[PDB]
Structure formats: C-alpha cells, structure tokens
Amino acid sequence: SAVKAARYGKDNVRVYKVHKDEKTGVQTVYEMTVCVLLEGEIETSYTKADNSVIVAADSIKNTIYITAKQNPVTPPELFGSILGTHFIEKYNHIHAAHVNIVCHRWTRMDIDGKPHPHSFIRDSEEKRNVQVDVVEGKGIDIKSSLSGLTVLKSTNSQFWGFLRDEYTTLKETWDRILSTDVDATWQWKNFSGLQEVRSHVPKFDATWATAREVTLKTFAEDNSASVQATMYKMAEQILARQQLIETVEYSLPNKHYFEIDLSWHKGLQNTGKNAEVFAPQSDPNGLIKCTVGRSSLKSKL
Amino acid sequence: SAVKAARYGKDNVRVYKVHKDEKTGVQTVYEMTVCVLLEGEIETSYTKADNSVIVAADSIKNTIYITAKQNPVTPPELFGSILGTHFIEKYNHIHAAHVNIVCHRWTRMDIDGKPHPHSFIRDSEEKRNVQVDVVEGKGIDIKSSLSGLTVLKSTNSQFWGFLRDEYTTLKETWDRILSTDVDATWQWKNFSGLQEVRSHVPKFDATWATAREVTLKTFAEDNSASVQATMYKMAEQILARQQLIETVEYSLPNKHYFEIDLSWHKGLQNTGKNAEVFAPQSDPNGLIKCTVGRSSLKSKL
Amino acid sequence: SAVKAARYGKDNVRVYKVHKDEKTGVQTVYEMTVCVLLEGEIETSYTKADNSVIVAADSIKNTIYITAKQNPVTPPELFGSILGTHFIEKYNHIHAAHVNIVCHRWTRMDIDGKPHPHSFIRDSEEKRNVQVDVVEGKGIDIKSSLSGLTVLKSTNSQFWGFLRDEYTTLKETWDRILSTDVDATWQWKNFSGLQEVRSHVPKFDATWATAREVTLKTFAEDNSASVQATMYKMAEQILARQQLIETVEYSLPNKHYFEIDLSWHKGLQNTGKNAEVFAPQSDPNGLIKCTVGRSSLKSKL
Amino acid sequence: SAVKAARYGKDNVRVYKVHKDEKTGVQTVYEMTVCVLLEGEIETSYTKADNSVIVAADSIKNTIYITAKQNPVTPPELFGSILGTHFIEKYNHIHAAHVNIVCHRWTRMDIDGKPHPHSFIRDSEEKRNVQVDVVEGKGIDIKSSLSGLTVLKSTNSQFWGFLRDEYTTLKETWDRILSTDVDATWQWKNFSGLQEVRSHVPKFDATWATAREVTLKTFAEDNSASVQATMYKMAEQILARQQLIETVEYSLPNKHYFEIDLSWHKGLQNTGKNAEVFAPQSDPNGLIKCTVGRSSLKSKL
Ligand SMILES: Cn1c(=O)[nH]c2c(=O)[nH]c(=O)[nH]c21
Ligand SMILES: Cn1c(=O)[nH]c2c(=O)[nH]c(=O)[nH]c21
Ligand SMILES: Cn1c(=O)[nH]c2c(=O)[nH]c(=O)[nH]c21
C-alpha cells in the first residue's frame, strides 16, 4: 500500500473581524468560515505514525486568527492567498495549501433613512466564497463564487421543443414559473504568487459585483427558452467584462412550481391562463450545469 | 383510557399565489407553508376505528388550495381566519381549527434602479408567521410573529452588575458584541368572528411593520445594559403603538462572539480596546424570554 | 407596561460524561444537550436594567458541568431534577427552573461478537428527552419522551371510511405503506421534591424501555385502521404498564409513499396489487396527535 | 464564448421499492435518492436555444422509476450501471451518464426476538452510496462509499510528537477522546460495460460489508497515534481483501471533546486522569484525508 493523495488540517473555523474608524465612529464587520488543508511530505504521518511532519490543525486554527489580526480579511481572494502562501513559505515540507472561505453577509442597517455606524443585518443567507490553492512552484489558483442566491420569476420562462419519445410525459409550456438557487463560479488566470494577486486586488470585489449584477439582470430580462440558454448568456457576459477570468461555471436547480387542477371542485379554473395557486415542489428538481470559456475555433464556427 | 386531547390534519403544505395586473403587467407573488389541525367530536377515530369523523388530511390540503384560489392570501392573519372559519362552519362536529402559516420573502428585484414587474429575490430567510385558533363559540385568537431576523451590533452592548458567587467566572464588560435571531410575537385581542377580523385588516400589515421597525431601531440605538433590558424597551414601544395588541413576547438567543487572546504569539494585542479578531460560538448560547402586557397596578408601582 | 412572563438562561449546552470501571476496564459514555431557563423575582433586569437579579447564563453553564461532575447524569429525569432543585434552593429569588435534556445515542460496539470496552456507535439519531420543571412550593413536573424514531411498514395499513364531500379526492385503500417519526411523551405524577424523584429512579429507564417496546410491537403488529387508531392502542398499553404516568401523548406525521402509474409506458402495471415502485413525498404530510389519560366516566361509557 | 463542460438532468429523485415473497409473506424494502446528469452533443441547448437535444429531466425522472420497476435496485452499483447504460445506448447524442445514488437504511424490526415480515426501522442515518459514471467508449467507473457512520472511543487515542513552533499552543496527550463521522470510498477497476459489472455483482455487497467491518474493528482496536495513522490501517486492510478495488479514500473529521478545568470551583479535579465531564465542540474540527493505492516502488521502499 502507498499514499496516492493526502491532505489534512482544520475545517469550520468561524472568524469575525471588526474595523473601527476612531475619527468617524463608523465600524465595519466581516464574518467568514475558513477551511485550510495542507499537502506535502506528510505520508509518514499515515504510514509510520510520524507526527513530526504534522503542523497540528490546532496550530493552523491559531494561524488563521493571527493572519486575520495582521492582514486584511477582504477581499477574501487576498486573505486566502496570504494564508496559503504563509503555510508553503513557513514549512519547507508543506508544498500546497488549500484555503476555502465562506463569507457571511452583514449589511449595514439603515435607521430612519441613515446608515447606522455599528448595527448590521443578515440581509440574505447568500454567500460569497473563494477556493484558493497555493501550490509551491505553481503559483495561486483562485476560484471565486456566489452561492445561495434564491430568485423567482412568475412569467417569461418557457420550455418547449425538447425531445419526445416513449419516456416523455412532460407537456410543452410557453409560460411557467422559473426559480433557482444561483451557484456561479469564476476561475481566475493562474497568479505567479502573492505579489501578482495583490496587483489585481480591486478586480476581486468588482468582478463579484459584475457576476451578481449580470446574474440578476439576465434572469429578470431573459424571456427564457430553458435554464441552459439563460445561464449561457450570464456566463458569456461575465467573461466579456473581465479578461483575467478564464471560465464561468453555473450550477442551477430548476425548483418546480406545479399547477393545481381544481376543475373537479365547482369547475374552478386554475390552469393555463387562469393559474393563480401553485404547489412548490421540494423535490425532485432539475439540475443544469455548464462551464463557459473563450473560443479559439477558426473553422466550422 | 380516554382521549384528553386530540387534533389531526395536514402539515408542511407549500402554497404559492400570483396576482397579475393585466393593465400594468406588474405581477406580485406570495409564498407560504401552511398547517391546519382540527379538533372536535373525533375521539371515536382513536378509540373505535371510526374514520367517519375524519375530514381526511388530503381533503384539508385540497381545501387550503381552494381557499387560496377563492380568497386573498394576504395579510396572513385574514387568510388564516378565513380557512379556520371554513372548517368549523362546514363540519358540524369540528369545533376548533388551528392554522399555522409561515410566509416566505419574495422581494421585487430592482434592475438598473427600476422595480422589475415579475422578478423576485429571497432577500432574507426572515419569516412573517401567524397562529390562528378558530374556536366555535369563542371567536378567533391570533398570534402574529416575525422570526429569523438575524442582527449584530459591534459595540454599545454591556453586561456588568450580574450576581457573582462560587459558580461565576464571567468577567464584567462595558463593550461587547451583541448578536441575536429575533423571534417577536404580538397577541391580538380575541376577535368574535371573521367579520371583526375583516374590520381590522389594515392593522395586520401596519403592526408587523411597526414591530420590525421598533425591533431594528431599538437594537441599533439602545446602549444595551442586557438582552433583558433591550427587549423590554422593544415590547413596551410596540404595545404603545397598537391598542388591539394585548401582549408582546420576545425570545432572543445571545449568540456569543468571544475575544481571542493572541498575547502568547509575538505579544500580539487582540483583547479589550485592541480586540479586532473574535471567535463566533455556534453553541452554547444565552436564551432570554419575556412577555410584556399593559399594567393595572395602582399601588406599589 | 409590565412583565407578564419571563425566563432566561442557557441553551444548547453540550455535555459528555464517561464512567471508567478501573477493575474491568469497561468505559460507558453519556452525551446530552442541556437547556436551563430560570424564573423568579427577575422583572427588574427587564424594567430597570437591574443585573443584580441575573444568575449569569455563563454561571448556569458552569453549574451544569459541576452538577454533572458531582452527580449521576442518568437517568436524565434524575439529573434534570437535581439541576433544577439546585437553582431554586441556592438562589432565594429564583422560584422555578426549567430543565430540558436531549440524550444522544452512544451504543457499545460489538467487535467479532464481543462488546468492546470503550468504542461506541451513534446507532440512531433517535433521542431520549426530559422536560423537568422544578417549581418552588409545587414540586417537580417531569415529561419524558422518545423522538426521532423513524419506522416504516410495507403493508397492514388501511385508510377507508373517512368523510367524503365536495373537497374529497382521496381514494379509499385497504393496503398502503405507513411510515412515521415517533414523538411519544409520558407525563409523570407531580413529585413533591428530589427525595420522591430519587425513590422512583428505576422506573425512569424501565418506563422509557416499555414506551419504546410498546411503540415498536404495536406499529409492527396492528393491522392499522388509521394513525389515530394505532397510536391510541400504544398510549393505552403504556398507561396500563406504569401507574405513576398520568398521560401519554403521541405526535405522528403520516409520511406518504405514493403509487406511480406507469401504464402510459408499455402498459407497465405498478398500481394496486402490482405496486412495487413508489415515490416517497417529503411534503406535505398528515399530522396526527392525541393525549390519552385514564377514564373516570361511570355512565354513558 | 464556448461550452467547455456541460451536464444536466434530475436530482433528489426519491425512490422506494418493495419485494413481496407471496410464499413466505416476507416483504423487503429499499429506499434511495437518485441523481442522473447526462453529457453529450448538447451544447446547442445552451448556445442556440435548441431544446431538441434535451432529454427532459422529467423524462429522466420517469426513466428512473421505469428502470427500478424492470430491474433490481440492489446492489446500487448494478442499478446505477443499468440506468447509466440505458441513457448512452437509447440516445445516440448522449455520450455520458453520471448516476449518484444514496441508499437509506430500512433494517427489519425484531419483535419478541423474531424478525418481523414487513416492519422496518431507520437504525442509522448512515448511508451506502454509489457514483457510477457510464462513458460511451470508456466503460463504467464506479465509486462505492459508506458515509455518516458516527463513532466515538473514550480512550486509546493519543496525539503527541507533532511539530511545535511559535504558532503552537496544543498540549501533547497520551489519552484523549476520538470521535468521527466516517466517509470511506472504494474505487473499482474500470468495467468494460454492463456485462462485466454483472459478472462481479456479489462483490459489491461483500466489499461494502468488508469496508464497514474493517472500519469498525480498526477504530475500536487501534491504540491510535493520530487520525492519519488509524485511517491508513483501515485503507490498507480493505485493499488487501478486494483485488478489484484500485484505491480506498477516507475523509474523517476530528470531532473534539475538550476537558473542562473545574479547579476554580471547590478544587474540583476534572482534568487528566480525573477527567469525567467534557465539552463536545460543534466547530471548528480537524479534517484528515487520504487516498491509498497499491505500491509499485521496487527501490528506496
Ligand atoms: C422542465 N424541464 C425538464 O424536465 N428538463 C428541463 C431542462 O433541462 N431545462 C429546463 O429549462 N427545463 C426542463
Ligand atoms: C453574558 N451573559 C450571561 O452569561 N447571562 C446573560 C444574560 O442573561 N443577559 C445578557 O445580556 N448577557 C448575559
Ligand atoms: C391519508 N389520510 C388522510 O388524508 N388523512 C388521514 C388521517 O387523519 N389518518 C390516516 O391514518 N390517514 C389519513
């Protein structure tokens, strides 16, 4: 037997950080959950009970809090890059650091139409995430994402012209409800190290804002032919707006709202143009995925 | 053996309703989860296998969708009162209907600074709830609530002067983080029937809006002496603003954010006035409850 | 405004305790989650920012661990009674202690057909719970429960003879799947204090075992006319087997398994006597409740 | 823009199947949740609103129930292989089918020491899973797993000799609690098609049973030097017992149980050899992973 793959460390590390402007009294909070898993010359911990190669997960936890004390926690792409770089530089025998960060929403409260200096509301369970893989000799691979963005449109969704055979019962529709939970990931060009990540810092918040804006506007305005066709338009617009992105991935459930035939009861009309009351279906659901990149096809376009 | 208490019916009934203004094209959606449990002369279903006294839960489910088709679903206090009244009036042997409704947020999307006619966002897992108990011969008892409103303030919370004995380790503080999930319930005066509920319909949305506004402003502006003292101020202001409320109940967890002593590492200062990085605690938590009503004490005030 | 009701304390306190037989090497573990809420002369903490009347929830947490160190944690009815009594005796101004305990399963592992001395498995998310209300001057009110016991029978469940009117679509059945999550509560006679609870200690484990045995055997052997009729038989047998119980309460969801008509596909027969493949429904569900006590009817039985 | 990756279909499809021995009256139930995602010449559904290439997820759902009606659902490796093969054979333009199955426990009830013919208990939320990737021209890749197996040992776990530097606070221990949720995956040799999967059918149940037995016995008997060292022993034994497995992967959280120093209270001794009461930590947790395969190193072993 031999170790083909190994990583270890600490998961579910909750972190809060406050910034206090002593001049204005304005406070700003940041809250996240962090996972750090290390790789390197660690196989003997598995094979030989050699704990000398283990940077204790407790120590990794201490290091997350120390890094957050001594560095910005925003944008999360930067914080993740700083943290991962620390582990591969500090420890000769550690050759990769895998940093996952989930960012929790704390939106400043408006009280009597004025922003409150130190009060916040969890305005959505929507998250902003990063996956930062720091690989010694191979730079920094960053995937940025928004997840748990739950949306619904009551019309301007269609689904007709799909394959029909002996397995098919679904009726074509020219007007249905569309509801999803948006998981959208943008994959950055490889960065050579922390200096190159730092040189692009304003692009992280800007690209997250673009991804969210494009997701909401496209969902709201596309007279959707399918989830497939709608998500492709979101991905192509985000790629057009940030050249340092290589790919945009969407993973979208089709959260069904079924019509309810009430015609058995006093001839009530609640289908088609008369549909007012629907049954939201918890399961099953459609699931639609794609990864969009830029073309290099020159023939048979 | 004898039946001391019994109720039965249908839980977790997901309901969506759309309103379509054909003039403006503006669509408005409502989504809820409904539970209806009936009481009455039903003991023989338990004791004698007498199913003749059971209004099938499947039929109760059909009735929820039919009621939603033929009546407003908003405010939920009205929808609940209509539904509960239907069961005690339709069925001679049914003497109480217990209607619980959870209302899910679908907030209209703003696209390029304009409200979209048919696109919505789940802007919070915060709920608006009702419990409506329709009791034949005893009218309609309504409890209204907001739940899952998650808030945090980074300063202007204190906790000192508490009892200290041989069980006490907690340090007094003059500056801590306060974070909670707000569960706030307002209990209406008994209504004689559906006509009296209908006569007060505008008060339901107005009182929910008042409860939320008072909760947010008080949380944000109170230099809090304790969760106890802060919630009491919220409850007294809501009672002052709606005479048809008898009681206001709060149930608030104290969701702890602990300081992290980093002085063992390079003398880093992260406690007291230098506290920037905190550890959010998932459990345990403080839990603080109270029900506030109006006084009738004339002596020893 | 005046305080009509108030309680406060600590929730979600996770507790583990190990017993080590040094003679045999056999270790036994206990794991629970504890909530303690106090009542008494505490209104000034709410009305006057008077923290002198608050036994800090942090101190209540310390007290749970100290009690567990100095006393048995089993049966949970005893541990809860000890803990609640401590608060009303130690603090003159505290007049009630509300102790909720959830007990988590750690079942000894059998390895090569022999019980392992120190290895355990979470063999079910089924819980054993207590609610212990210690009220100064009014003794100790205990409710014991089992919850999250998930069961299914594939036949010997029926549902016919229910009310049929213009709201009814459900077909009568003489053979259906029955599946539920069992919540069963037994309410003890009021105990005068801790001495009387201690005098009955063996009855707590014995009555929990009886409730579980009766629940499983009745579910498995009753050719069920309805959930109502089946749960009534469980409750009456548990009352017959423990005179110190006053009431037995069941709360049972009817977790539906729907037939799937496949006759549209190659005439496949999958309904009635040919039903093999079913669709489990996550929601909605039936919900059936009753509280059974002993009779004192002497006429019109 | 161009489609670099795409799949779509149906998730969260709950399936139940009953087998009825008419001779013995013995019934056997199977319950699972199924996901099927297809790949192939489907990019035009994304780029051109061409729904002609979509096998509707509703049709995929119908096909799961039809397959379950016409074929064994056990072992899940076989059911998954049948289902995936159907999609790549039926549809010329579909070139891969990705089938994920979660199997839910329904263990036969023993009533009065005899197995009941038609009553079952969810004896654990532990799952048995498969991932079956059917790739046209490349056969059938199967990963089998057990997940959610929650275990604890109260002693015979150690953690000492780990790296100590300026980030390290953790104390070495020679006796701690070890608790985890076991996620164990075994990767099968590539199968050429459905005939080769069928030729190995008895190996699926046997290898799952081996993986579980080895996991439980090793956890219980290993005087653990670390999670790393313990999981490596499990993986090497499972590889030794099934030559058709290429790799065994473990993913194990270290679910911490912290000692509680009570010496501040009446000198109570609850640490080290006197530790009886512990605080289970919900988060953070250690996370330890490895993939073990067979060696081909001939030098520098
Ligand atoms: C309703 N529906 C299916 O059944 N499949 C699909 C699909 O892949 N995409 C859709 O937009 N809708 C839909
Ligand atoms: C921190 N803290 C306790 O320990 N108990 C209590 C309490 O009841 N109320 C608070 O506001 N804080 C607090
Ligand atoms: C299927 N079904 C209903 O619709 N209602 C009821 C009920 O109250 N009890 C049952 O056992 N089944 C059932």
Ligand SMILES: Cn1c(=O)[nH]c2c(=O)[nH]c(=O)[nH]c21
């Ligand atoms: C307690 N502890 C750490 O902090 N890290 C680790 C690790 O990787 N492995 C362990 O078994 N324990 C442990």
